[PDB]
Design a protein around this motif. Structure first.
Motif, PDB file in Angstrom:
ATOM      1  N   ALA A  22       0.854  -1.187   0.000  1.00 31.79           N
ATOM      2  CA  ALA A  22       0.000   0.000   0.000  1.00 31.79           C
ATOM      3  C   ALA A  22       0.891   1.238   0.000  1.00 31.79           C
ATOM      4  CB  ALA A  22      -0.944  -0.008   1.195  1.00 31.79           C
ATOM      5  N   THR A  23       1.306   1.634  -1.193  1.00 31.71           N
ATOM      6  CA  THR A  23       2.162   2.789  -1.403  1.00 31.71           C
ATOM      7  C   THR A  23       1.490   3.750  -2.375  1.00 31.71           C
ATOM      8  OG1 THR A  23       3.383   1.743  -3.224  1.00 31.71           O
ATOM      9  CG2 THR A  23       4.222   1.408  -0.994  1.00 31.71           C
ATOM     10  N   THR A  24       2.050   4.954  -2.457  1.00 30.76           N
ATOM     11  CA  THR A  24       1.643   5.946  -3.438  1.00 30.76           C
ATOM     12  C   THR A  24       2.893   6.662  -3.919  1.00 30.76           C
ATOM     13  OG1 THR A  24       0.133   7.787  -3.906  1.00 30.76           O
ATOM     14  CG2 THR A  24       1.297   7.816  -1.794  1.00 30.76           C
ATOM     15  N   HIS A  25       2.799   7.272  -5.097  1.00 34.29           N
ATOM     16  CA  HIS A  25       3.959   7.946  -5.659  1.00 34.29           C
ATOM     17  C   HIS A  25       4.312   9.185  -4.844  1.00 34.29           C
ATOM     18  CE1 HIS A  25       6.498  10.107  -8.629  1.00 34.29           C
ATOM     19  NE2 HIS A  25       6.821   8.881  -8.995  1.00 34.29           N
ATOM     20  N   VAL A  26       5.599   9.541  -4.873  1.00 36.77           N
ATOM     21  CA  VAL A  26       6.086  10.674  -4.102  1.00 36.77           C
ATOM     22  C   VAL A  26       5.486  11.988  -4.593  1.00 36.77           C
ATOM     23  CG1 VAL A  26       8.159  11.848  -4.962  1.00 36.77           C
ATOM     24  CG2 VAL A  26       8.190  10.692  -2.723  1.00 36.77           C
ATOM     25  N   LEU A  27       5.050  12.056  -5.855  1.00 34.93           N
ATOM     26  CA  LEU A  27       4.378  13.238  -6.379  1.00 34.93           C
ATOM     27  C   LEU A  27       2.865  13.164  -6.220  1.00 34.93           C
ATOM     28  CD1 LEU A  27       6.502  14.059  -9.537  1.00 34.93           C
ATOM     29  CD2 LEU A  27       6.784  14.752  -7.147  1.00 34.93           C
ATOM     30  N   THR A  28       2.390  12.521  -5.158  1.00 36.77           N
ATOM     31  CA  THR A  28       0.967  12.487  -4.861  1.00 36.77           C
ATOM     32  C   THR A  28       0.478  13.883  -4.493  1.00 36.77           C
ATOM     33  OG1 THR A  28       1.056  10.180  -4.149  1.00 36.77           O
ATOM     34  CG2 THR A  28      -0.761  11.518  -3.320  1.00 36.77           C
ATOM     35  N   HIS A  29      -0.668  14.272  -5.055  1.00 33.46           N
ATOM     36  CA  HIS A  29      -1.127  15.652  -4.926  1.00 33.46           C
ATOM     37  C   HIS A  29      -1.397  16.019  -3.471  1.00 33.46           C
ATOM     38  CE1 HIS A  29      -3.627  19.268  -5.542  1.00 33.46           C
ATOM     39  NE2 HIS A  29      -2.953  19.386  -6.672  1.00 33.46           N
ATOM     40  N   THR A  30      -2.137  15.170  -2.749  1.00 34.49           N
ATOM     41  CA  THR A  30      -2.407  15.439  -1.338  1.00 34.49           C
ATOM     42  C   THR A  30      -1.119  15.517  -0.529  1.00 34.49           C
ATOM     43  OG1 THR A  30      -4.605  14.425  -1.413  1.00 34.49           O
ATOM     44  CG2 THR A  30      -3.528  14.566   0.738  1.00 34.49           C
ATOM     45  N   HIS A  31      -0.116  14.720  -0.901  1.00 34.66           N
ATOM     46  CA  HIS A  31       1.174  14.760  -0.221  1.00 34.66           C
ATOM     47  C   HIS A  31       1.796  16.150  -0.278  1.00 34.66           C
ATOM     48  CE1 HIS A  31       5.007  12.139   0.644  1.00 34.66           C
ATOM     49  NE2 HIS A  31       4.533  12.736   1.722  1.00 34.66           N
ATOM     50  N   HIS A  32       1.543  16.899  -1.353  1.00 36.08           N
ATOM     51  CA  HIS A  32       2.210  18.175  -1.579  1.00 36.08           C
ATOM     52  C   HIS A  32       1.359  19.390  -1.240  1.00 36.08           C
ATOM     53  CE1 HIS A  32       5.847  16.809  -3.948  1.00 36.08           C
ATOM     54  NE2 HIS A  32       5.132  15.701  -3.863  1.00 36.08           N
ATOM     55  N   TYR A 104      -6.158  12.819  -3.046  1.00 35.64           N
ATOM     56  CA  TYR A 104      -5.957  12.962  -4.479  1.00 35.64           C
ATOM     57  C   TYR A 104      -4.689  12.230  -4.897  1.00 35.64           C
ATOM     58  CZ  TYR A 104      -9.625  16.435  -5.385  1.00 35.64           C
ATOM     59  OH  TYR A 104     -10.829  17.077  -5.555  1.00 35.64           O
ATOM     60  N   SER A 106      -1.610  10.940  -7.802  1.00 39.09           N
ATOM     61  CA  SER A 106      -0.473  11.582  -8.461  1.00 39.09           C
ATOM     62  C   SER A 106      -0.720  11.765  -9.954  1.00 39.09           C
ATOM     63  CB  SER A 106       0.792  10.772  -8.213  1.00 39.09           C
ATOM     64  OG  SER A 106       0.660   9.458  -8.731  1.00 39.09           O
ATOM     65  N   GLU A 107      -1.850  12.379 -10.299  1.00 36.08           N
ATOM     66  CA  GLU A 107      -2.200  12.587 -11.697  1.00 36.08           C
ATOM     67  C   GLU A 107      -1.625  13.894 -12.234  1.00 36.08           C
ATOM     68  OE1 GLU A 107      -3.065   9.764 -10.317  1.00 36.08           O
ATOM     69  OE2 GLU A 107      -4.547   9.447 -11.905  1.00 36.08           O
TER      70      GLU A 107
ATOM     71  N   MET B   3       1.205  11.573 -13.511  1.00 37.18           N
ATOM     72  CA  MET B   3       2.456  12.186 -13.090  1.00 37.18           C
ATOM     73  C   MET B   3       3.440  11.175 -12.515  1.00 37.18           C
ATOM     74  SD  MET B   3       3.404  15.284 -13.491  1.00 37.18           S
ATOM     75  CE  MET B   3       4.998  16.047 -13.240  1.00 37.18           C
ATOM     76  N   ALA B  22      10.056   6.082  -7.300  1.00 39.47           N
ATOM     77  CA  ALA B  22      10.051   7.098  -6.246  1.00 39.47           C
ATOM     78  C   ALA B  22       8.672   7.109  -5.594  1.00 39.47           C
ATOM     79  CB  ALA B  22      10.420   8.464  -6.809  1.00 39.47           C
ATOM     80  N   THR B  23       8.466   6.165  -4.681  1.00 38.04           N
ATOM     81  CA  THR B  23       7.201   6.024  -3.978  1.00 38.04           C
ATOM     82  C   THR B  23       7.413   6.192  -2.478  1.00 38.04           C
ATOM     83  OG1 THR B  23       7.309   3.621  -3.642  1.00 38.04           O
ATOM     84  CG2 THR B  23       6.466   4.409  -5.760  1.00 38.04           C
ATOM     85  N   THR B  24       6.295   6.258  -1.762  1.00 42.88           N
ATOM     86  CA  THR B  24       6.291   6.288  -0.308  1.00 42.88           C
ATOM     87  C   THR B  24       5.044   5.557   0.161  1.00 42.88           C
ATOM     88  OG1 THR B  24       6.555   7.701   1.647  1.00 42.88           O
ATOM     89  CG2 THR B  24       5.011   8.438  -0.055  1.00 42.88           C
ATOM     90  N   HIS B  25       5.077   5.081   1.401  1.00 50.33           N
ATOM     91  CA  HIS B  25       3.950   4.310   1.901  1.00 50.33           C
ATOM     92  C   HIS B  25       2.721   5.197   2.057  1.00 50.33           C
ATOM     93  CE1 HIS B  25       1.517   1.736   4.607  1.00 50.33           C
ATOM     94  NE2 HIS B  25       2.122   0.763   3.953  1.00 50.33           N
ATOM     95  N   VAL B  26       1.545   4.575   1.939  1.00 54.13           N
ATOM     96  CA  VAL B  26       0.301   5.327   1.991  1.00 54.13           C
ATOM     97  C   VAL B  26       0.034   5.878   3.388  1.00 54.13           C
ATOM     98  CG1 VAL B  26      -1.442   3.609   2.621  1.00 54.13           C
ATOM     99  CG2 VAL B  26      -1.927   5.314   0.823  1.00 54.13           C
ATOM    100  N   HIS B  31       1.545  12.981   4.333  1.00 56.88           N
ATOM    101  CA  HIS B  31       0.373  12.698   3.517  1.00 56.88           C
ATOM    102  C   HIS B  31      -0.911  12.852   4.321  1.00 56.88           C
ATOM    103  CE1 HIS B  31      -1.163   9.965  -0.012  1.00 56.88           C
ATOM    104  NE2 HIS B  31      -1.561  11.220  -0.109  1.00 56.88           N
ATOM    105  N   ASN B 155       3.298  22.391   2.904  1.00 57.16           N
ATOM    106  CA  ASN B 155       2.404  21.623   2.042  1.00 57.16           C
ATOM    107  C   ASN B 155       0.945  21.816   2.435  1.00 57.16           C
ATOM    108  OD1 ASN B 155       5.013  20.799   1.582  1.00 57.16           O
ATOM    109  ND2 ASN B 155       4.547  18.605   1.530  1.00 57.16           N
TER     110      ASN B 155
END
Lengths: 300, 300, 299, 295, 301, 301
Positions: A22-32, A104, A106-107, B3, B22-26, B31, B155
């Motif tokens: 259960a991961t998401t990309h580092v450029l995830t919108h909510t992350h930033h 959100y 990483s779109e 993205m 380049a991922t990170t955990h959810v 986040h 952020n």
């Protein structure tokens, strides 16, 4: 040691995936940029089995928070209710904290919400309540009702709570007391606050403070036990001279307060009303009584 | 379209990892709670090659933002400066937008920052400028200087910018004009604002608005071109009767404002002072001019 | 002069002569205002001179000290007994009582470390009550709940009240109406404010002091079958009220006939105000045996 | 140990009274309601002898503060200046802190015939930790911020006591708008890239020590800016220090756990601290108007 | 045009022709906004054309003049009879009534000493799809009036500049009405209407602090109690309105206008809700005489 | 005694009409909602003839005010400048106060299809208060909020707050009020900009929430021409108490000294030296005794 490295499954976009997957990309919108909504839900071991406390209220608030942020959850409330049960059942947890979170993807990397895909995750994992904690009023002002959406439990808005909690900790205390932009007592860093004076319960009106579900539960328990409860604007010095004071929250349950800004609260220990409500709330969430069975959702 | 599904590299904690890796955990802390800092840097194609515009100011501000949030960047400023150039070079970018971002890892889910690991990411990727945009004043109040840390580029603080930009767009406009809690003009959703009246340039005091690097750059260019500039409090109706107005930002560069709340700004067109400053800023970043070579760092 | 009087002043445990109750000119509270006090009344009753709600005033005095982190070196029963002694041993048939707690002259810095806590209690011995008073809204903003401790009755906080009262007096009025930082009606210079509109009593919700006399009026209004609502009130809402009056320990029930040149109702004391004023005087004078606990015989 | 049981004299309504005999009644009006104004003045040892630093400015501000509170001082400015010189001389003080204070007597007890009394009493690091006060600084229309009044220091006592209980040395005050205002009893300055920044005199004190720093900064070639300052702008400043009559120049090395610069006394702070000391000690003959010999 | 039409207008104790109801262009209220007015509706009832809550609107008119230190040279009974005259003499079956108290053209200074008070009452005959499908509302970037800057209890003439600015903004943004926030950021009212929301069967409305004590608002509080609806007066945030099950405006000219969307957030199902329909039907049955109760609130003309 | 029953002419929508004929319908939109803009202009007796002082600045501010309020003036600046001179010339006024006023007509009655009308009236123009000082009381009414009303526009309905404050100052024994902004700082008088002098330096509130007065702008020019140092900053009420001098500036007030504020004597309680020189310089400028700034004096004939 890490919150990412552990066994089990996480409900991720409709499917049960392994915990470390259960991961998401580092450029995830909510992350930033902070645009996301989340919940805090607890599951308790009851004589009837593992039960989630007021699952429907937390799911409804999740959808309400997402509706405030114009985020369309790609699921109905029934599925989210079922998925929150599954997050505890499919991990064989006897008691757990549950983190439903809508974010959100990483779109895109712009501030426009169009094109961004909505993702949903639900992760579940396994003296403060006794004598009372030390509280210091935060020098950071609590959220403004026209700057951040105070009825939404949004991700990015918790910087203010973190800054205040770090200040309270670095000052020798356990928790911070937040004041609204008008100077009145609002809440703790992540808890609602109650005070007792002459056997009457006082708590701040839901203006800038979050409409806590534990808060609502204590309002119902107080009425059922015959307590007089008053919602009004409370000042910091009104808390100083209260007979009792405690915090309410999903994670904190009912936590007594023994000292605010160096002022001893009453006799400086857990007061009679606090102990009665704390005991009533714990018996409610742990299923020690058949009362309010509609608030307990069995996980299996 | 995404993205994350991209070919290239992203600087991830001292190593150049593949873009899709380049991922990170959810359950990443930033986040869920927005506690993190980031920057927005542009790379331009100059006669001397691809250059980063004011790399030192963005890295210095990144460390300032982390210092405000008590986040310890585990890398020196030189290491970040070298890694920022690496994010543009190693992706073979002629002109790029660079996103350095510092966030807490997926170590814990409590509001306490203790035990959280600090990660650093540096990702880089490739008419309104000449016509001008329609602006509408935001009904959402800009950040409060004692609720959010307005000097930090954090952020979670950008929820308010997204709410405002969506309102402006849903109203048929291109951008929002933010008012501070006192009712005075502060900035755009992601840009600083300037107005021109009788050949004098006016901009809000760095109070509730972000100390923009493009803003500070325009202050230098306006002085070099003999324009008297005054920093003072500005009301929304003062913007209505200004001769000119424009936005400044790393992404927005110099964007003229032709209309606010239906009131045409001067001639409803990029005025003389804005055009001269716009050309002067574009000539500066693309190396068409000569001076301020210290603001253009070669990437190769 | 308020210092050259015959009688006794309860001073740090003992009854000293009135002119002997002095303090050094470098007293900390005198220079920095850090101190708390109370205003208590004694009335003549059929049973004799009695202090009205002595327990409530003593509890609030300790609350105000607790807010300021001032340790009163006496228990509540000793202060209660001392307050009765201040009236009894002065042979007063009806009195105003001023218990006051202040830091001594042990230091001159802003830190309270090393300062001794002293306690003193001094007790001493018509058209406005019938015709109402003129009120001008104050141009000074009332205290902010996070700048000063509004629930505490502190000495230094009354600078704001003196500025507002002198402004109203120089403006031809008898009293000022304070507005809170948000612009809503808070109180008078030293009294709480009530208004009547269509038979309903309205009073501002507790930046104003939680007045004890305000609390008795809530009780008397319910006993006399009057609906009472606590809510935010605007200045123009007072202009169109049928009745208006102030409530305080020293002022009891003072009608208001005019605010900012706007006549209030008929320009004189109204019916509800008359019945509450009558009910308050009957309560403190012992004319009714009800609320006997609120009348403590001085003996 | 007490501030009353001391040897010396106190100027008390025109005459010099023994320190132990300078008393007032317990029902003094200023004691119960806070209506009074005061000053903090320092005397320093100079090569010419003991000299009071900027006596005229403190006496003028004392009459200003009284004027703000509609208190009529029963003396002229010359009498107060001369009495302030006497408070140091007649106590044989080589260097002293001077406390002129104006207060209402024990004539009445209402809130409205009060007599005005005047007293003048005289008696003899690398950076501190600062925590932002959760108490808001005074509001410019609730209390008179240009007047140095007695009762207005309850807010300072609450903030200082909060900072100390939190493990710090001094408090940083924020105005009702949330901007940095001052310290507990001192003005605040910050330095960023060689430029000095101090809060615009909004809810500020108009400190005389602050006004001397403006002059000393300009004479040492330092650009100074008066503007609104946020708390996090202090976090990222190169230097920060307090200024007060009794505190002179106190460096600030940490605010809310954020290290200020290198966490020690900075170069600009050092130069302004030495310049202020050389000014008040009369090391050079510059600004001799600001030193009034006590003898 | 509101001037070139047939009819009579009550003008200082006399019925003058509609086109002859004029005032000098240097009229004080025209230039400085110092004046008070009312908005009153007349409806067709089984008993004939009746004014709805004539007493409450006249009383508030005198309250607003009292707030502004304006002396109406007539009694409340004379204003009641004049309001009926503006409807009866014009042969109106259902009308909107505009009683207006203003300062004449006696002086041009800001001082009120010397200005004569005039009273005008004009009545003229009276969006239905919006009444049943809901309207689009956009929060105003203009802040609602401050309780110490303008007298919010008085229905004053010059105070409606703020309403016009916000209505123009909402319209230019694609919506039909604006939602006003007070200086503190909480929900106050619409541009010219009070606002209500429904959440889990409970009606919520902002407390009468920075908003106007609307008579239509006071009527809905009575109609809500008679239908067993729990009504709570409290401070409301903009995002609390987003998540409400229902929302509607109340006003004399607006009656009960449902709200289907606020700031692009769909309100509930996006149409008129059940509680709103019951209160709206109750309000129409009340003003039109379909119910017999509240005969005091229907003054035959 | 009235402002309507007078002889002369008023410029009314492109034409001159008899003074008593310059009327508007009583249902005029600006009359009921305050939405309109106006100006205050002076004509002085100069050696070259009757001249309007800074005609262009007042006409430009009128169009600015109408642009802020989204009011389209049906006439150009050149027509308004010419009409303003005609209002003075055709009445044969040696000196006059001019009231250009833009207002919505009587077309509609909702908060569209409103017609814009323009009128320009001119009539002939306290001397002891001009050289000795006035009494000032700080107003208990808070001055306008920069996001509630448009503080840069001179709008009709916004002057309710000025009337409320002026009446308070008069009922308290004073001649003028001092307004505080919503933050508590000094903004202006009821209709004048305020200045204070301390140690030979002029201080005045920055163009924040107060009106950018044309007379204030002239004083900034004159103060610079006289070598005076002038500082714009936030001013508290008690900072005014301890100033050496204080005065008001305005089109009608010119330069009015302030001797007392809230019972506090200002300095020596009389007109200070700096006030006297600036008052002299302003009177010499507007009356043509000094030939400097010829573009600021527009001859009427």
């Amino acid at each position: 040691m890490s919150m990412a490295d552990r066994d089990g499954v996480i409900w991720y976009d409709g499917e049960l995936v392994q915990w470390r997957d259960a991961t998401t990309h580092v450029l995830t919108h909510t992350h930033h940029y902070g645009m996301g909504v989340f919940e805090g839900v607890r599951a308790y071991d009851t004589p009837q089995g593992t039960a989630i406390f007021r699952l429907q209220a937390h799911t409804d608030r999740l959808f309400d928070s997402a509706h405030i942020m114009n985020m369309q959850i790609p699921y109905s409330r029934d599925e989210i209710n079922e998925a929150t049960r599954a997050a505890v059942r499919e991990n064989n947890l006897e008691s757990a904290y549950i983190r439903p979170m809508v974010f959100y993807g990483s779109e895109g990397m712009g501030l426009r919400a169009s094109g961004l895909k909505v993702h949903v995750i639900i992760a579940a994992w396994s003296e403060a309540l006794q004598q009372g904690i030390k509280v210091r009023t935060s020098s950071f002002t609590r959220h403004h009702v026209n700057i951040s959406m105070t009825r939404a439990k949004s991700n990015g808005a918790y910087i203010n709570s973190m800054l205040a909690l770090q200040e309270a900790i670095s000052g020798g205390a356990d928790e911070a007391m937040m004041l609204d932009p008008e100077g009145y007592v609002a809440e703790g860093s992540g808890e609602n606050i109650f005070i007792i004076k002459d056997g009457v319960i006082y708590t701040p009106e839901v203006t800038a403070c979050l409409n806590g579900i534990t808060r609502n539960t204590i309002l119902t328990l107080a009425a059922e036990h015959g307590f007089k409860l008053v919602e009004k604007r409370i000042t910091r010095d009104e808390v100083y001279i209260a007979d009792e004071a405690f915090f309410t929250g999903t994670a904190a349950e009912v936590t007594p307060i023994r000292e605010v800004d160096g002022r001893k609260i009453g006799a400086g220990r857990r007061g009679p009303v606090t102990e009665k409500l704390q005991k009533a709330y714990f018996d409610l969430v742990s299923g020690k009584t058949e009362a309010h069975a509609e608030w307990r959702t069995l996980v299996k």
